[PDB]
Structure 1
């Protein structure tokens, strides 16, 4: 149908059809009379999967012969989503499969909807890992993603009576055709025990053993015949485990619980033992695998020349003392040499400055679970603090501030401090964030070792986030500037010469309208909700957090409603306001915010005076597959975090690439997005970081805003009196109390500027031609935000490897 989806050649389609039929018979053990849509999906998945095999074997064989430096990306989260369409895109098989299935009497799009998301992540951090894997393969790097194979990913969200309910995400129920179990490469992991000091070094003895069984998933590069590996570890009990008899067998579950479920808490560090076990489990298994592969290439001087380990946040921070343990205790290297190797191989990426999210493990927990690692951490700290003392003599408070060991009620280990000490590179994820790191929370470390601190602005893959989810837009772009931009997104700048092109303006606007109609139809079929497709699609999708300020959005929505009720016969630009995202199960306030959104919808969506001029919809079960549907349909992207709180954001970049305009604060990557597009083409509002600081010095008093802004007063009175909860008048008292007395994120302070800015958005939307011209200016300058750019920078500036766009020979 469309050019970017590849060729549908006669021999290719014929071969695909017969292999589809073969799999339906031999693999699924079905025939056409009894086969269901799910069976057809699996037949297609196996057919496409076959095409990865030759490329996967020869890519890994190529790395063995060429022996390049290997990149190991360690993360507790890989938010992969669906794999079928992505695989077809990267292999140039999409049109061929579309034709093959069509001739079989099947709709491929219908089959694609059957696939479960691999939801092995919470949000931004997990999805970054996934985009990074795609970019590393596309850029021909010898890269490996290492994580945990959770049997249950992020929970499925159900909304019941307006409240979030959590349901287990049993994603493996029907099987996962994309993984390959490798039980032959199973490795032991040790827990508990004690440390013995013999004449020749320390010995970690009397340990409990849990086995780590790897599952490998292929990661294809874009049309370059490279297929890299994501290896995820699964926990298995040893066969002599606990070995009355029946109970011993049943107790195997305790060991295997390590890989059972993804921790869904992305707001607050809890310090749970099971989470610590997960973190060590992934680290210990991975490092054995790394060292094994290195020895197959005696002397560890060359280790950093052949290995780079990237730590995605502090979650895999135990890699640092584990590498030291292996080098000192097992390989018998001297401490100083081992430390040199460790620092040169490890690098650390930070994703937040909010203190409550930072990992600070109780010493008593590490003492019991990982006694040797605690000893190593103490020695690292002692040697590090001796360096600080030499550099800043007499500065005793610096010594307490920089210590890896935090004193107090319970002694804790600061894992961020551990990461800085043991890494040659530390990076933030957007320019403003990386600057905040150097100026605030890591200032002491920056003064000691300035050379360690870097910026690597986040990005998104244009394969999933344009070609896959928005083929209409990809096609009209390709018509003008060709196909090269898909792996070189900076070429989008060439679209600036089409900003006054009447045909292109019409085409961009047409694609958006079709996307909106498609999504409006999806909402009616799968959720039975009715929306006006001609309204402005106002979208805020992301995890529910106070700092992300879904509440500020809520205040604007109520303002719009109240203004309509005040002047019903006055014209307003029609809006569909969509808010979606999951709340961490233990995050009370976030759960209350979800309830508020639905409660507003109940009032607004059923007011006859409002009509179809304003709709408020909560998007249930927001996840990667839903993002691929809603983002291409959006007109307005809400990126409204308090300045200095969102490290980068990546949803923002997805919206920019897909033809939405952005209303946002100068926070995270928003700053660089406005810089690229021009501030005139962005709807910037609110306090800058400096303004937040000034307000903090004075002390934030919300009552002042309440007293001075009558429209704000009305809303708070409505919330307090039970206007949005007639049966439970005091339902939202927790929300009001927080806003008035304990609001860390200064919602009221940005209210006036936000409302005014929103008026300017509505004014532009009244002029379709000028709206679209501004959209073109955004799409055309989105190039910087390709994860290909991001990865090239990691490669050159941290890992010491050169990216390559050169094809591997076709199988």
Structure 2
């Protein structure tokens, strides 16, 4: 059908069709008379998987021969989404499979909707890991993703009476055709026990053993025949575990205790909960991974070359135990001296920070580490002592620097600061956008920066143009390719060439056409799967991301209510119609975030059924926001809401997805928004609100929300409506907590940005009245979105952190 989806050769189509029938018969044990769409999905999945195998075995054998430096990306989260379409795209099989399935009398797009998302992540940090694996394969790096195979990923969100209900994400129920169990590579992990000191070193003894079983998932590069590996550990009890009939039975049933380690992903987005189970997960992935790393290195005695052959990237502090675990192995097991072991560790490890919010930082109580990991605590104390000696020597007599920089936090409960541990034990520390990285140097890690300025770097985040353009928006990818060819898909800087098409009337028409088709298709999806009705001619105003106070979904709510009140005041006046879509999950125990969801639905209940409003304003809450839903709503959007309080969103990546797919951005000068506006030109961006400096000034003075309430009549009206029960007639005080929070304890200064936000929103509406000028500004965004490709991000990591050269050269097919 379309060019970028590859060739549908006579011979390829014939082969696909016969392997499809072979798998349906031999693999699924079905015949065409009983087969359901799910059976058809699986036969296709298995048929496409067959094409990976040859390339996967030869990629891995190639690494064994050439022995390049290996990159180990350690993460507790990999937010993968669906795999079928992505595999077809990267293998150039999409059109062939489309043809082959059509000839079998099947609709491939219908089959693609049957795949479960691999939802092994919460949000941004998890999806970054997924984009990174794609880019590393595409750039020909010898890279491995290492994490946990959660039986249950992020929960499915259902909305019931406006409230969020959580249900288990049983994603493995029908099986996962993409993974390959490797039980033969199972490894032991130790917990608890005690430390014994001998003539020749410390020994960790009397431990409980949990087995770690790896599952390998292929990661194909873009049309380069490279297939890398994502290895995910699963927890298994040993067979002498807990080993009378009641006693015998119970001992077998208690195997569950060990296997609970890999059962479920913690659903917290930017908040730290000090739970033992979570600590076990963190050690589990670290201990199993490091043994695999060492095994692979030994199959290349001399650990001097270890950092020449190994890089370990820590995705936040979650796998921070890699540092003392590497020390433990090198000192206790390999018998290296401390200082040499430490040199190796530092040169091997690097740390990426993803947030500045204090409540998100990992601070493990000492008594937890004492019981679960007694040897690691000793190594940590030893690391701390040697580190503080260096601080003392560099800043003599600065006793307060010593307590500020300590890995050990004293107080009610003693805690270990894992961020401090990572900085001390890594040769490189980076933030995820230029503004975020500067904030790390000037505020939270200022002391560490003064000690070791050379450690601190920036690596602005990116998103893969494969999943986030070609896969989810084939229409846009095609019209771009018509003008500038296909090479941009792996070299996104080439989109700049679209600047010379900004006054091209054909191109303007095509861009606007692709968007309207995306909007029609999404409007249909809402009717079919959710029986909700929207005007596809209205402006699609969307904010999708995790529900958090810092992200200020509440500021969006205030604008929405303002528009509604303005309409009710002047019903027969013209306003640009909007569909306001807000989606995202709240962490199960975050009361305020759950209250915000209820507020959103409550506004919709009033707004969507007011006859005077008509189809001029619609408020929709997008249920169960996840990777596969993002792939649908992002191409359909006109306006991207990126309205976090300046200084709080480290980078953001949703912002980039929208820019690449033809939405204009309303946002604050926060995270990557700053660099996006810089690339496109500020005139092509809807920037409003306090900058970081303005937030600082307001804090020095003290934030008084009352002041804004007193001086803004429109804001007063909204608050009074909330208090009085306008949006909750049967529970008049339902939103008292929200009002109280806004008036008295607002950490994120919602009121302070309200006026500029509403003002700027009027400028958006004005521009949308002029279709040709809207579209020309759109073209200016798409054309400057090149910097935000994860290929760029990964090449910077490779060159400035890992010390390896990316390559676009094909491996033989």
Query: Do the two structures share a fold, i.e. TM-score over 0.5?
Result: yes
CA deviation string 1:80-133 (max 9, x = no partner): 000000000000000000000000000000000000000000000000000000
Report whether the alignment pairs 1:675 with 2:650: no
Distance in 2, Cα, partners of 1:448 & 1:701: 38
Q: What SS does the aligned partner of 2:478 have?
A: helix
- The answer (yes or no) to whether the contact 2:607–2:618 under 8 Å persists in 1 is yes
- The answer (yes or no) to whether the contact 1:576–1:616 under 8 Å persists in 2 is yes
- The answer (yes or no) to whether the contact 1:220–1:226 under 8 Å persists in 2 is yes
- The answer (yes or no) to whether the contact 2:73–2:145 under 8 Å persists in 1 is yes
1:42: how far off?
0.1
Q: What SS does the aligned partner of 2:218 have?
A: strand
Q: What SS does the aligned partner of 1:633 have?
A: coil
CA deviation string 1:143-173 (max 9, x = no partner): 0000000000000000000000000000000
Aligned residues: 810
Distance in 1, Cα, partners of 2:112 & 2:271: 36
1:558: how far off?
0.0
Distance in 2, Cα, partners of 1:676 & 1:586: 39
Task: Provide the TM-score with structure 2 as the length reference.
Answer: 1.00
Q: What SS does the aligned partner of 1:659 have?
A: coil
1:265: how far off?
1.1
1:270: how far off?
1.3
Distance in 1, Cα, partners of 2:398 & 2:335: 36
- The answer (yes or no) to whether the contact 1:458–1:650 under 8 Å persists in 2 is yes
Q: What SS does the aligned partner of 1:202 have?
A: strand
Report whether the alignment pairs 1:415 with 2:434: no
What is the aligned partner in structure 2 of residue 12 from structure 1?
A: 12
Q: What SS does the aligned partner of 1:647 have?
A: coil
CA deviation string 1:721-741 (max 9, x = no partner): 000000000000000000000
Q: What SS does the aligned partner of 1:610 have?
A: coil
1:231: how far off?
0.1
Distance in 2, Cα, partners of 1:140 & 1:267: 32
1:266: how far off?
1.4
- The answer (yes or no) to whether the contact 2:463–2:657 under 8 Å persists in 1 is yes
Distance in 2, Cα, partners of 1:308 & 1:146: 13
Q: What SS does the aligned partner of 1:558 have?
A: helix
Q: What SS does the aligned partner of 1:663 have?
A: strand
Q: What SS does the aligned partner of 1:458 have?
A: coil
Distance in 1, Cα, partners of 2:75 & 2:290: 13
1:67: how far off?
0.2
1:388: how far off?
0.1
Q: What SS does the aligned partner of 2:620 have?
A: strand
What is the aligned partner in structure 2 of residue 559 from structure 1?
A: 562
1:267: how far off?
3.2
1:754: how far off?
0.1
What is the aligned partner in structure 2 of residue 701 from structure 1?
A: 704
What is the aligned partner in structure 2 of residue 282 from structure 1?
A: 285
- The answer (yes or no) to whether the contact 1:303–1:345 under 8 Å persists in 2 is yes
Where does the alignment leave 5 or more consecutive residues of structure 1 unmatched?
A: none
Report whether the alignment pairs 1:651 with 2:646: no
Q: What SS does the aligned partner of 1:261 have?
A: coil
1:531: how far off?
0.2
Distance in 1, Cα, partners of 2:300 & 2:799: 23
- The answer (yes or no) to whether the contact 1:267–1:584 under 8 Å persists in 2 is no
Q: What SS does the aligned partner of 1:214 have?
A: strand
Distance in 2, Cα, partners of 1:622 & 1:249: 39
- The answer (yes or no) to whether the contact 2:143–2:228 under 8 Å persists in 1 is yes
- The answer (yes or no) to whether the contact 1:636–1:660 under 8 Å persists in 2 is yes
* Poorly superposed stretches of 4+, deviation over 2 Å: none
- The answer (yes or no) to whether the contact 1:55–1:226 under 8 Å persists in 2 is yes
Q: What SS does the aligned partner of 1:632 have?
A: coil
Q: What SS does the aligned partner of 1:308 have?
A: strand
What is the aligned partner in structure 1 of residue 155 from structure 2?
A: 155
Q: What SS does the aligned partner of 1:440 have?
A: helix
Distance in 1, Cα, partners of 2:440 & 2:727: 41
CA deviation string 1:417-454 (max 9, x = no partner): 00000000000000000000000000000000000000
1:520: how far off?
0.1
1:221: how far off?
0.1
Q: What SS does the aligned partner of 2:733 have?
A: coil
- The answer (yes or no) to whether the contact 2:384–2:406 under 8 Å persists in 1 is yes
1:351: how far off?
0.3
CA deviation string 1:480-529 (max 9, x = no partner): 00000000000000000000000000000000000000000000000000
- The answer (yes or no) to whether the contact 1:426–1:452 under 8 Å persists in 2 is yes
CA deviation string 1:538-576 (max 9, x = no partner): 000000000000000000000000000000000000000
- The answer (yes or no) to whether the contact 2:634–2:658 under 8 Å persists in 1 is yes
Distance in 2, Cα, partners of 1:561 & 1:790: 42
Q: What SS does the aligned partner of 1:641 have?
A: coil
- The answer (yes or no) to whether the contact 2:270–2:355 under 8 Å persists in 1 is no
- The answer (yes or no) to whether the contact 1:70–1:142 under 8 Å persists in 2 is yes
What is the aligned partner in structure 1 of residue 688 from structure 2?
A: 685
What is the aligned partner in structure 2 of residue 124 from structure 1?
A: 124
- The answer (yes or no) to whether the contact 2:276–2:368 under 8 Å persists in 1 is yes
Report whether the alignment pairs 1:390 with 2:421: no
Distance in 1, Cα, partners of 2:317 & 2:269: 13
Measured on the aligned residues, the alpha-carbon RMSD in Å equals 0.2
Task: Provide the TM-score with structure 1 as the length reference.
Answer: 1.00
Distance in 1, Cα, partners of 2:377 & 2:352: 23
What is the aligned partner in structure 1 of residue 48 from structure 2?
A: 48
CA deviation string 1:192-234 (max 9, x = no partner): 0000000000000000000000000000000000000000000
Distance in 2, Cα, partners of 1:634 & 1:407: 49
Distance in 2, Cα, partners of 1:420 & 1:527: 48
Distance in 1, Cα, partners of 2:590 & 2:443: 27
Distance in 2, Cα, partners of 1:757 & 1:391: 50
Q: What SS does the aligned partner of 1:459 have?
A: coil
CA deviation string 1:291-318 (max 9, x = no partner): 0000000100000000000000000000
- The answer (yes or no) to whether the contact 2:78–2:127 under 8 Å persists in 1 is yes
1:268: how far off?
2.1
1:630: how far off?
0.1
Within the candidate set 497, 501, 512, 1:498 is matched to 501
- The answer (yes or no) to whether the contact 1:280–1:318 under 8 Å persists in 2 is yes
CA deviation string 1:33-90 (max 9, x = no partner): 0000000000000000000000000000000000000000000000000000000000
1:617: how far off?
0.1
1:622: how far off?
0.0
What is the aligned partner in structure 2 of residue 242 from structure 1?
A: 242
- The answer (yes or no) to whether the contact 1:78–1:121 under 8 Å persists in 2 is yes
Kindly report which structure 2 residues correspond to 1:61-100, keeping only aligned pairs within 5 A, or say none. Answer: 61-100=61-100
Distance in 1, Cα, partners of 2:683 & 2:177: 48
What is the aligned partner in structure 2 of residue 206 from structure 1?
A: 206
Distance in 2, Cα, partners of 1:23 & 1:532: 44
- The answer (yes or no) to whether the contact 2:159–2:623 under 8 Å persists in 1 is yes
Report whether the alignment pairs 1:452 with 2:455: yes
Distance in 2, Cα, partners of 1:596 & 1:30: 49
Distance in 2, Cα, partners of 1:719 & 1:370: 50
- The answer (yes or no) to whether the contact 2:317–2:422 under 8 Å persists in 1 is yes
Distance in 2, Cα, partners of 1:434 & 1:267: 18
